[PDB]
Design an enzyme around this catalytic site. Structure first.
Site, short mmCIF file in Angstrom:
data_model
loop_
_atom_site.label_atom_id
_atom_site.label_comp_id
_atom_site.label_asym_id
_atom_site.label_seq_id
_atom_site.Cartn_x
_atom_site.Cartn_y
_atom_site.Cartn_z
N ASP A 139 -5.30 11.68 7.46
CA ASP A 139 -4.11 11.01 8.03
C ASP A 139 -3.70 11.63 9.36
O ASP A 139 -4.09 12.75 9.72
CB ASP A 139 -2.99 10.97 6.98
CG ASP A 139 -3.11 9.76 6.07
OD1 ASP A 139 -2.94 8.61 6.52
OD2 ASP A 139 -3.39 9.98 4.87
N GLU A 183 0.92 -1.15 0.00
CA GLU A 183 0.00 0.00 0.00
C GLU A 183 0.96 1.20 0.00
O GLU A 183 1.78 1.34 0.92
CB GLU A 183 -0.98 0.12 1.12
CG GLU A 183 -2.30 0.86 0.83
CD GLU A 183 -3.10 1.25 2.04
OE1 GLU A 183 -2.72 1.07 3.19
OE2 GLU A 183 -4.19 1.77 1.74
N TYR A 227 -11.10 -2.62 2.81
CA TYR A 227 -10.26 -1.99 3.85
C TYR A 227 -11.11 -1.89 5.12
O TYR A 227 -12.05 -1.09 5.17
CB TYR A 227 -9.69 -0.65 3.42
CG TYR A 227 -8.52 -0.12 4.19
CD1 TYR A 227 -8.64 0.28 5.53
CD2 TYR A 227 -7.27 0.02 3.59
CE1 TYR A 227 -7.54 0.77 6.24
CE2 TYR A 227 -6.17 0.52 4.27
CZ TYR A 227 -6.31 0.89 5.60
OH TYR A 227 -5.21 1.37 6.24
#
Ligand SMILES: *Cc1c(COP(=O)(O)O)cnc(C)c1O
Ligand SMILES: *Cc1c(COP(=O)(O)O)cnc(C)c1O
Ligand code: NA
Ligand code: NA
Lengths: 255, 392, 392, 255
Positions: free
Chosen positions: D60, D49, D175
């Site tokens: 993030d 990834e 995911y």
């Protein structure tokens, strides 16, 4: 009050005008101030206009404003002023002495009590800079009761109603500060007003003579004297010398 | 005179003879104006369309939690300029114009009066010169910039102890000579007649609005109306309309500074002696042998060493009560308003609030409807409060 | 969704999956609220009784001398807080409460949004945490004090180029985890749906009042309404109600900074490229390979590197026109208002004024009735203007 | 797309879970980054990834946030990323490569054009962090047209409507970031969703094994790897050593 009447009489027989210097009590020092006054008188002053240092002279200019600061710095107080005054009188029994005050200094310990002490130390007149004729009742009456001449300023913008009031209420002399000045002196004389002394910007002999000729009974030298002190604040011996001369000059020009 | 220059024994016109004509002219003009509906209409237009009147009356939500006190604030802080001073400065400006004047004279300390006169002048197109004590200048840089920005000429005065006190002298000296073309825009409901009267009539909308607002919201008049007293305009502005409603208490709050007992305060009405200064006979801060003394307060806006004569009068007859609030008490009232109502009040106005908080805290089960005149916003004060707190 | 997240091609919900539930919840609540007359009444009470609405509409007196332009100012500078931001921050606060929330999250740059959220929180009793770019913190000390004073927790963020841009990230990250108890009070009519819509509906009183005020005073609608565009809330606030009055021109003014040609500006709507950032697809300041870039303007309040999607839309279809005004042009407009009307405007609002002055000066014999949204007061700016002028 | 299907098949015959490390392209340098990836793969990574440095990763954490800053400082650009990618593929033909992107970097030069170049360099999947299923249409379709697996995050607060959508729309893998996680894997399998990889906080072998046992097809090590780089940013030789070991560990625990 008596002293003024006496002065103006004598002046007349000698057909001359009165020369009246202004000074701040205790400027630049107490003894220096006393030394200065003795000179002014010796140099020819006919009378005296003395100021008592006040914190807020909303009626004075920087020249006088600075005089007060000097006195204050010297440690002068009203109380000290009155001591000086008894002393001045002690040595000079005939010279008319007028005071330039601010209403608070007079009101402070009761009006009557103020004039009482004036009479006691031998002061002839009092000018309360911030009391118009309109609010003078209490000051006037108290002055008269203690045989003190209440001095009043006659301004440039003075109308007729004012002229009549200033004539009636004042004594000793009239403080002269549109209107053809010649007509002012005229109107006053007509109203039987106390002798008018020309106060606005009298700093040269030329002006003294003019005032007299114009019909004034003399002239008050408002700040010219305070200037000399300042100019020579540096050197005393010359402060006096300059004083003697200036006065001698102004006086000569009154005859 | 057309009107009475005196309130009981306080007031009058204690000025050099030279200024009587100017004062007489001013009073004549004010009287005619008062009666001129056209004047009244013009004034009302500006207040509303330019200044933002009527101001709000905010009911506090959190500050009175756990008590039976209902606290309302007269939002003068919401006025263009951020202080009540704007109301009368507009009235005076309009007045100078009616008299055919084109120049304005003002003096200032903290700077709010300078700023307010500068703004009134800018808007009505008058030349404006402002006298300032160089001491105050140095510490009121921001206010000086505002003034200049607005096209007002700032004349620094040093004479004596370069302060309002001296500012006033030069202002007065100037006016003696120029009263023909210029108008002196005195800063508070003090000085010689007819200023105490004029300034009052031009500030009375505060009280008149409060009265209408409260009757609408609560259906009854307040128990008391509280305002700080520097010189007294905001206070009399608030009080004026309630004077005849004897059931309404009038409370004026003077700066206690470091505390009375210290001598370092600014509460002449209650802790000073009547004297003669600034063309009026009123209580003042003076030495034993009569020299006028300086006031003291954390808030520069409460620095007038005397008080309006109408106040001294209202006190005398017991119609209104005067109290003092210390620096420390003001500061806590400041912080408390921020925290609970998200309103930053002027340190001046904080003195009135602090007193109302006192009333509430001392007698928490006492039911009372109070109104505090929030005379200004505290933006101008955050630096002061800052450097106080950090220091602590 | 209950409503359309898109204005033409601009808008949408470009956020991590984790945040969709929060946005969906918010939109549901807003829709119910809108229809709740009780909600509307509460909101209206605060605006009026606490903030000071309706604001005045001042007719300029001196500034348009020698021209056929009539210039009016929407006095948002008179709002509690001194900027238009207060209106929506109260709406949002009231909304968090309806959703049973007790915490508020906000981010800020210049500080006005932080201050406004802090005040709304203090008043309605919400816990408030504000993310700030340490760069902005350092230069917005005064705003930080205000915030703390009001009981808001100020969390300095350093990550990246410690600025709004990054502030927003942490704000968003926080909310992802806490949306259950906390509400994110976004600062402008941008970001993901339904913020562009919410912020608009909560700022639309500006325009609705202007419309009524103008019809009363002039008996006709303005030719154009001008407002500055940072992110776009004041603008859409003003515009919203006039959108259907096709005869009324809508002019939004973006910061030109040093000048377009220099690249140092903040005008994405006209000089940037559409992209995807802050949960929306709209024009923005980005590099050739897609990195979002910083805006530039003398006024920190106009520093949003993008613009509300409704604006991008109104432009697209030609309903509204967007122009730019440089630093220098803003500064002169600043000074001109002070001098002639005695009003100190925010450097932000000066951009809208500067443009209206342009219209007037270029075509002095053209008769036109203009309205400028004076979004804020310039007290916060005197230091900037100061150090600019002195430097010059 | 094909590569994932291949991987998950092989994994099954060997009844083991996939270990997928995350890294930032060009962090801390281009050659250093390339050297790092070769180690991860050699150490046992089943897939990769990879992140493309973006200016505003509002999705993030500080760990990844700092990675981007390092890359940027290194002079990395999307363009440089794609060069690196062709290179990685060139040496490692079978390893599945997934990209973690931000919607702007994809939208920049036209969506289709983005996926076109992915397919061209031999990228298997793409995860656009800031595109919810609700706004994925254009990204999805473009991905599918260029045989790119569009990866979607399945959040903790995921409801059923979302579960069905993620199952239908995604490919390669799911995911995985209340809800008894066991039921999540369950519901997905039921909806025929792409194999679920456990992404939330997998930083110890204990966690890898758990995920597998829980029904996950493997685990993504989100930032544990970025940490090592940081910790040893100082010393490279040890950055690799630490990397090798960590990976070897995590991998062993998948069997
Ligand atoms: C100037 C000022 C005062 C003091 O003035 P007053 O004449 O006593 O009313 C009080 N509050 C504010 C906000 C001021 O600016
Ligand atoms: C914050 C601010 C702006 C910019 O914000 P918008 O969202 O574009 O309306 C403009 N003016 C003032 C006074 C502000 O505080
Ligand atoms: Na006082
Ligand atoms: Na912008």
């Amino acid at each position: 009050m008596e002293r003024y009447e006496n002065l103006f009489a004598q002046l007349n027989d000698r057909r001359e005008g009165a020369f009246v210097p202004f000074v701040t009590l205790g400027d630049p020092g107490i003894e220096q101030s006393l030394k200065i006054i003795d000179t002014l008188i010796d140099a020819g002053a006919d009378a005296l206009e003395l100021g008592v240092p006040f914190s807020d002279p909303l009626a004075d200019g920087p020249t006088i404003q600075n005089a007060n600061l000097r006195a204050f710095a010297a440690g002068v107080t009203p109380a000290q002023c009155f001591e000086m005054l008894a002393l001045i009188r002690e040595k000079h029994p005939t010279i008319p002495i007028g005071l330039l005050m601010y209403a608070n200094l007079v009101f402070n310990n009761g009006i009557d009590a103020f004039y009482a002490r004036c009479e006691q130390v031998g002061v002839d007149s009092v000018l309360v800079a911030d009391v118009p004729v309109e609010e003078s009742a209490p000051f006037r009456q108290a002055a008269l009761r203690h045989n003190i001449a209440p001095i009043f300023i006659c301004p440039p913008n003075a109308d007729d109603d004012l002229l009549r009031q200033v004539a009636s209420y004042g004594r000793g002399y009239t403080y002269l500060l549109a209107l053809p000045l010649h007509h002012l002196i005229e109107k006053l004389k007509e109203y039987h007003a106390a002798p008018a002394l020309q106060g606005f910007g009298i700093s040269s002999p030329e002006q003294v003579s003019a005032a007299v000729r114009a019909g004034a009974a003399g002239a008050i030298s408002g700040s010219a004297i305070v200037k000399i002190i300042e100019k020579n604040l540096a050197s005393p011996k010359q402060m006096l010398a300059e004083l003697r001369s200036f006065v001698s000059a102004m006086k000569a020009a009154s005859r | 005179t057309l009107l009475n220059p005196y309130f009981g024994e306080f007031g009058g016109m204690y000025v050099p003879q030279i200024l009587m004509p100017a004062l007489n002219q001013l009073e004549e003009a004010f009287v005619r104006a008062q009666k001129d509906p056209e004047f009244q209409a013009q004034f009302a237009d500006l207040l509303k369309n330019y200044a933002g009147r009527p101001t709000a009356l905010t009911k506090c939500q959190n500050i009175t939690a756990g008590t039976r006190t209902t606290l309302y604030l007269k939002r003068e802080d919401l006025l263009h300029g951020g202080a009540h001073k704007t109301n009368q400065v507009l009235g005076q400006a309009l007045l100078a114009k009616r008299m055919g004047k084109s120049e304005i004279i003002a003096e200032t300390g903290a700077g709010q009066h300078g700023v307010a006169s500068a703004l009134a002048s800018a808007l009505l197109g008058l030349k404006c010169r402002i006298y300032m004590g160089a001491k105050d200048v140095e510490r009121q840089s921001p206010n000086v910039f505002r003034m200049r920005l607005m096209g007002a000429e700032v004349i620094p005065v040093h004479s004596g102890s370069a302060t309002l006190k001296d500012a006033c002298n030069e202002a007065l000296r100037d006016w003696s000579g120029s009263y023909e073309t210029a108008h002196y825009m005195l800063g508070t409901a003090a000085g010689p007649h007819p200023y105490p009267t004029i300034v009052r009539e031009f500030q009375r909308m505060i009280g008149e609005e409060t009265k209408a607002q409260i009757l609408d919201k609560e259906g009854r008049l307040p128990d008391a109306v509280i305002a700080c007293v520097g010189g007294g305009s905001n206070a009399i502005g608030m009080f004026a309309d309630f004077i005849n409603d004897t059931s309404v208490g009038l409370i004026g709050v003077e700066p206690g500074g470091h505390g009375i007992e210290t001598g370092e305060h600014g509460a002449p009405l209650k802790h000073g002696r009547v004297g003669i200064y600034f063309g009026m006979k009123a209580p003042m801060m003076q030495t034993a042998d009569g020299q006028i003394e300086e006031s003291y307060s954390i808030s520069a806006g409460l620095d007038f060493p005397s008080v309006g004569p109408q106040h001294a009068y209202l006190n005398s007859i017991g119609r209104a009560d005067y109290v003092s609030i210390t620096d420390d008490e003001a500061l806590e009232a400041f912080k408390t308003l921020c925290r609970h109502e998200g309103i930053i009040p002027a340190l001046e106005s904080s003195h009135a609030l602090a007193h109302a908080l006192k009333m509430m805290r001392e007698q928490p089960e006492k039911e009372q409807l109070l109104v505090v005149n929030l005379s200004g916003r505290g933006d101008k004060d955050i630096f002061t409060v800052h450097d106080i707190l950090k220091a602590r």
